[PDB]
Amino acid sequence: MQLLSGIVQQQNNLLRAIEAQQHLLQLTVWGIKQLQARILAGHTTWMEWDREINNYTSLIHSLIEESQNQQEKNEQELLEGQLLSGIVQQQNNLLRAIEAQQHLLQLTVWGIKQLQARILTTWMEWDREINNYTSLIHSLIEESQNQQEKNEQELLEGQLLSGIVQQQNNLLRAIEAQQHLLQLTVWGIKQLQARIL
Amino acid sequence: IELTQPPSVSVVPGQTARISCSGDNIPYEYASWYQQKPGQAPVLVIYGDNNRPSGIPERFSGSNSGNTATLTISGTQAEDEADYYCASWDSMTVDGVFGGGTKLTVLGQPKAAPSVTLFPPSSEELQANKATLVCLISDFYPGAVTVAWKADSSPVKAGVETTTPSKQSNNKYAASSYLSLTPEQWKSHRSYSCQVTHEGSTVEKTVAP
Amino acid sequence: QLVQSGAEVKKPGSSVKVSCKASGGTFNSYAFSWVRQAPGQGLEWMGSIIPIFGTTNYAQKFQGRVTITADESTSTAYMELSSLRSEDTAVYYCARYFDTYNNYGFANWGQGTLVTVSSASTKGPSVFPLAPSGGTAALGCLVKDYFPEPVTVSWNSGALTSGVHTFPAVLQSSGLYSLSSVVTVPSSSLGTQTYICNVNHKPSNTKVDKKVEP
Ligand code: NA
Ligand code: NA
CATH class of the missing domain: 2.60.40.10 (Immunoglobulins)
Known part of the structure; x- marks a missing residue:
């Protein structure tokens, strides 16, 4: 049945995007650490930053691995109820990963902002863009959580089908907003590196 | 971070090898393991918590407990003979760090005592007003040896240069030792000996002007 | 990559x-x-x-x-x-x-x-014969005081290949290298067969042949 296989295929693609975004995020973290070791903003605060980074990085990896497991199960089910259930759970997995990545992304904005305080005016214009996309992704996440709740409720007790399709749209929108934020943090870091020494 | 590895570990073909690396701090996921053979670049064998790259045999696995990581090779093959290095990163500073490396020997090769050939200075070299004795040492195993020189059964220490041992095609080892002398020194002693000690047993050669 | x-x-x-x-x-x-x-x-x-x-x-x-x-x-x-x-x-x-x-x-x-x-500065080697003196005999060439590595050694213009062992160089305190190459040959060949070592050091453009005599 092509509708559901089409959703499973798109879920694989969203997960792939999440992994590529995790990779970029990780590079931004490393880049921020290199800059901080040179610039040295303010230290216990940076130790807690580092701890938080490590916590969320661990979380994200676990979510990605669980998503990879669920993806494999759904693709098995396609060959084989359980499919709809697995598709909903995969939407939950992807949403948790996006939420955790968004927190990680906000930790890098914190780091970038601490550094740009010492290298000092298009920071304010960079700020406005960060805020705009932060608000957008927050509202997309909020809407995605509500939809997930409705789908899960219906799954237990179609509005289910419609809710699943709309949730695909919600997730992709949020991943797309995250991409824009990543381009913004990449820009901020290059701009900082260009100004040192 | 300072990563401590055992200098060497040995195993029988089919037996399991275990190479420890102690010193890393959390997160341990930053860590990795490398295999390096002579004259080759290192090869990544494990990264993070027991992740194997494509093309790395299943007999290789990584584990960890506290600040101690362990590379395990189940049913080790002779081709597993190599140096193995652990590495990690410091979390706050992103400083890389390697352990000191562990040479893994897979046992099988019998003990072989060195063959030694000792050559006196050539007439031609003596005419150029120089003198060197050439002590050539080959076909030994294991691959470690000490060299002592004597002139008339008294120890000579000056003018001695000796190579480190190196692998032959045999998988046996070779080294050489050179004793430099003036022609006057050379011609004013009755005999000279090159003495090679390998696993507590000494092989001697002597030459006379 | x-x-x-x-x-x-x-x-x-x-x-x-x-x-x-x-x-x-x-x-x-x-x-x-x-x-x-x-x-x-x-x-x-x-x-x-x-x-x-x-x-x-x-x-x-x-x-x-x-x-x-x-x-x-x-x-x-x-x-x-x-x-x-x-x-x-x-x-x-x-x-x-x-x-x-x-x-x-x-x-x-x-x-x-x-x-x-x-x-150290680039330098070609001096080559000296290691003369031989029943079964088998060892004869060779000593390749002395060159920089940098490497030196190539062949015997009898490449016709002699078995029993050749060219040893890894020693690095002397002077900063210069020396090495030796030896061939084990039958004692009975020492009269009949000529032995010549062919030494190449490319960095200094040195090509030297040395006859090794009993
Ligand atoms: Na430690
Ligand atoms: Na680094």
């Missing part, structure tokens, strides 16, 4: 810049370290670059002596090490990590670049 520039021979106090051309991925997804290895020794991490930002960090031992750079349009990373000393003699590797988002290990390595730091 990673192809480095060729071997270098330098004098104390000079500089060296080693290159590493990366092919077959996305440049902006790269993360590189430089890692060195003295002969017979372990790996030593020198520093890193993240090319998408151009951000770097170096091991403290090398602060003020080393610069890591990368160029996107030529897809090449560089390591420049200044105020060279004899203890900097090593194979230098570029290495890429972050092959995937959770792979912090070095997945790809360059072939390595040997950098030899020495005050």
